[PDB]
Design a binder for this molecule. Structure first.
Ligand code: HEM
Length: 464
């Protein structure tokens, strides 16, 4: 109009910008376009909508300003809200139950709260190690076993339910329902207006699944309020805690939604972090050797780790942070424009437009990361960490709407890597070619490794 236009790449009357949306992982197509447009952002004119991907660290520092751009439930989250409800992940900050749930749960997710969950985390991690011990020489299904690990951990810490997912290949009917529900939610975005016979019955089953999950969690709540409530659990906490400002408690409906919300937002994000980390250690095996050495200094023999142990880790935490930089598992979350705004002093953003953070480009943008495409766990160290661009690492969201579960997922995954590397030697039997699938989150699809028990003489410890 009087300033610069956002760059748009055109490709034939055949197709359009729509080809950039096909495939298992569109965010990766966006990443390929961001490497060839150094301006810092681009736009796709899809039919009926405009999508703006931003990745320059200074343009992102602008989009991070909650005074101008904020999370907005409408469009993007409206389907996932079918089962997220008004819980933390699928509500706007100005809805009463967001402020309430935030102010109540924030302390229960703090780093100080983690020690109290460590027992349950360790139970689930040892279950996983057991399954792999019992199947040495068999193909380990990495995505699936991490899904099990984290789904079980967040259920056990979230409402003290044990799905015992390492006892049997079949998942509990509740988790099968969760799985079907989530996938239907992701396909609901592509809605052909004519509804096929099978689509209408898909929807019937969809709300039936949502109902059967609501039913199990409603019953757990009923049965523990009957026993006096007050477990040392996220559900135990929500049954009793009062909001510091409103003085009231969460409703029963909101508590069921927060439990569903823990499951939605916490299982595939964390399991993907672990799937990817294992892939990266397999393709950067000198780092994996460093990890082995850390494990053999702190967990020699059949030592059983404590929360303290996890806290004294160094290699494994930085492996995890750098892994998040390569493959952040929620890669394309959008901020909405509160008012018409001008970014970089250059581009024209109309009120209510979605700016998707292209996390892959941002985390690998060479302006902020010398040698962007190379794995260095030493980038994260106290001193080198302070040298990073302050808006270019955003694996856990932004501001008021940043992931509450960060410390939960990071302690869970430190523990997982610790116990796995303690007991197992990893092998890649098939030349795994990374294959990314995107839903709410991105994750490796057909990853298979093999494990042997580590022989005593293969530990880098100091003898008894
Ligand atoms: C590595 C694992 C995880 C990563 C990378 C991650 C990342 C993120 C990101 C990027 C967001 C922002 C979403 C948006 O603004 O649209 C978010 C939100 C959220 N995540 Fe996580 N998350 C992880 C694990 C977890 C876990 C384990 C929990 C709890 C069990 C959790 C609970 C939440 C919640 C409640 C929100 C909404 C925050 C609010 O509105 O107050 N996340 N997460």
């Amino acid at each position: 109009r009087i300033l610069a236009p956002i760059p748009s790449p055109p490709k034939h009357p055949q197709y359009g910008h729509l080809h950039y949306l096909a495939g298992d992982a569109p965010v990766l197509n966006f990443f390929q376009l961001a490497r060839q447009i150094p301006e810092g952002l681009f736009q796709l004119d899809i039919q009926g909508r405009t999508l703006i991907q931003a990745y320059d660290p200074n343009l992102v520092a602008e989009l991070t300003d909650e005074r101008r751009f904020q999370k907005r439930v409408h469009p993007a989250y409206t389907n996932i809200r079918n089962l997220g409800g008004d819980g933390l992940f699928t509500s706007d900050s100005f809805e009463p139950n967001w402020g309430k749930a935030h102010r109540i749960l924030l302390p229960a997710f703090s780093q100080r709260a983690m020690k109290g969950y460590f027992g349950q985390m360790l139970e689930v991690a040892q279950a996983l190690v057991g399954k792999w011990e019992r199947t040495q020489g068999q193909d380990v299904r990495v995505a699936d076993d991490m899904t099990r690990l984290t789904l079980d951990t967040i259920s056990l810490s979230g409402f003290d339910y044990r799905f015992r997912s390492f006892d049997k290949d079949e998942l509990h009917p509740f988790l099968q329902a969760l799985a079907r529900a989530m996938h239907h939610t992701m396909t609901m975005f592509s809605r052909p207006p004519v509804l096929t016979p099978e689509m209408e019955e898909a929807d019937r089953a969809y709300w039936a699944d949502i109902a059967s999950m609501n039913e199990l969690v409603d019953e757990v709540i009923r049965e523990r309020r009957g026993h006096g409530g007050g477990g040392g659990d996220l559900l135990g906490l929500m049954l009793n805690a009062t909001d510091p400002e409103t003085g009231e408690r969460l409703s029963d409906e909101n508590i069921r939604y927060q439990v569903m919300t823990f499951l939605i937002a916490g299982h595939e994000t964390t399991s993907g972090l672990l799937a990817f980390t294992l892939y990266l250690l397999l393709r950067h095996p000198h780092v994996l050797a460093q990890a082995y050495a850390e494990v053999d200094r702190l967990l020699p023999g059949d030592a059983v780790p404590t929360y303290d142990t996890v806290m004294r880790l160094d290699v494994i935490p930085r492996i995890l942070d750098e892994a998040l930089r390569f493959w952040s598992t929620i890669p394309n979350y959008a901020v909405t424009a509160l008012q018409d705004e001008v970014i970089g002093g250059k581009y024209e953003i109309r009120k209510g437009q979605q700016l998707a953070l292209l996390i892959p480009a941002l985390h690998r943008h060479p302006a902020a990361w010398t040698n962007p495409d190379e794995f260095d766990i030493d980038r994260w160290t106290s001193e080198n960490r302070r040298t990073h661009h302050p808006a270019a690492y955003k694996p856990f969201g932004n501001g008021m709407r940043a992931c509450i579960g960060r410390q939960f997922a990071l302690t869970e995954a430190k523990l997982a890597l610790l116990l796995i590397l303690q007991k197992f030697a990893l092998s890649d039997p098939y030349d795994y070619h990374l294959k990314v699938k995107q839903s709410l989150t991105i994750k490796p699809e057909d990853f298979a490794l093999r494990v042997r028990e580590r022989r005593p003489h293969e530990r880098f410890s100091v003898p008894v």
